[PDB]
């Protein structure tokens, strides 16, 4: 009962297996070189606009989420 959730928000555009493996991603890695974001787009049929901005804008939301504090 407890148990609860929330969001479902934002402006973005994918697939389901497309965030599951966007995901999955920024998981090992915060950012990803030219060499590989540009292959990726092309493994989950994104745009390198769309590999570039969901992560970019992804970390920025993680740190708020990670302890890391610096």
Do not use: C, H
């Amino acid at each position: 009962g407890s148990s609860g959730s929330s969001g479902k928000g934002g402006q973005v555009r994918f697939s389901n297996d497309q965030t599951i493996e966007l995901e999955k991603k920024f998981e090992t890695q915060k950012y990803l070189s030219p060499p590989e974001r540009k292959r990726l787009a092309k493994m989950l049929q994104l745009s390198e606009r769309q590999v570039k901005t969901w992560f970019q804008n992804r970390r920025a939301k993680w740190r708020r989420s990670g302890p890391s504090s610096g």
